[PDB]
């Protein structure tokens, strides 16, 4: 009876930096995945372990919507079995990922004349991220073995890096808002279905 609030996710006013990616759980509602899949707004709408076509025939315990901004160059990384700064240090999907990656170009909102540098990605981490892990640390990162604790040397780095979103940049360098929908089928009853 209740329509799932996908507008609150896809049409949000502000968007998280990828390092601090936002998550919204949705349940106890009904979703028509083709009003979205057949909207012409989205530049990328790919799924994994499931197929975009049959999305309404499926029924899940809960669905998670994760949203954030990255470069166009890095939409390839929001995928199972990928590596690179984003998959490695920012947003990791599991290799048995079931769900959908939806992305659209957002130059018109997320850049400014002179450049928008409000979006951050993590450049440095001691280890790769486990699937769906989320690190918002600002601890100084030690590169090499000269220690950084206390008095801090040259090989000591603030972990987060600004994106430089210039209006005139190449389409790979431009910001993309990205939504990942994860389909959690448990051993409990289903709450998110098709029409």
């Amino acid at each position, epitope marked *: 009876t209740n329509l799932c609030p996908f507008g609150e996710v896809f049409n949000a006013t502000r968007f998280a930096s990828v390092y601090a990616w936002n998550r919204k759980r949705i349940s106890n509602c009904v979703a028509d995945y083709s009003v979205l899949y057949n909207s012409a707004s989205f530049s990328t709408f790919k799924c994994y372990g499931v197929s975009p076509t049959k999305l309404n025939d499926l029924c899940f315990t809960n669905v998670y919507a994760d949203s954030f901004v990255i470069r166009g160059d890095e939409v390839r990384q929001i995928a199972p079995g990928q590596t690179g700064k984003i998959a490695d240090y920012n947003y990791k999907l599991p290799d048995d990922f079931t769900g959908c990656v939806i992305a659209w170009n957002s130059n018109n909102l997320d850049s400014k004349v*002179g*450049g928008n*540098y409000n979006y951050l990605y993590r*450049l440095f981490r001691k280890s790769n991220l486990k699937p769906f892990e989320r690190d918002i640390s600002t601890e*100084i990162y030690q590169a090499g073995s000269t220690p950084c604790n206390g*008095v*801090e*040397g*040259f*090989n*000591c*780095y*603030f972990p987060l*890096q*600004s*994106y*430089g979103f*210039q209006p005139t*940049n*190449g389409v790979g*360098y431009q910001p993309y808002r990205v939504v990942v929908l994860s389909f959690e089928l448990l051993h409990a009853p289903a709450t998110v279905c098709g029409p």
Partner: nanobody
Amino acid sequence: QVQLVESGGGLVQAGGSLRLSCAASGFPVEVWRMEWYRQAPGKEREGVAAIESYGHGTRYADSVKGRFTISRDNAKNTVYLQMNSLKPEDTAVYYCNVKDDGQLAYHYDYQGTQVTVSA
């Protein structure tokens, strides 16, 4: 359009003082970490000092802590390196760099400024 211009340097007696400036064009110097490197003759490049984005800290090599001071002028879009208590092993060519991580179409590696400290 994006460019890094070093200025200052020259000849100074040991114990002397000097200030090098790095004038950036095409981006704001506060957004990313900015660095000073030096390459003595017949040695490899060494990291001297760095100032992180947005006042997230400064970093100083052991060789020059307490004698060198790095700073940002957001109005002049310029990073400065004050050089005090100059020892002679501080003789090198000095280079500034942006740790932009590919976030701008840079032509990444490029002139430098020579500093010479007498005995």
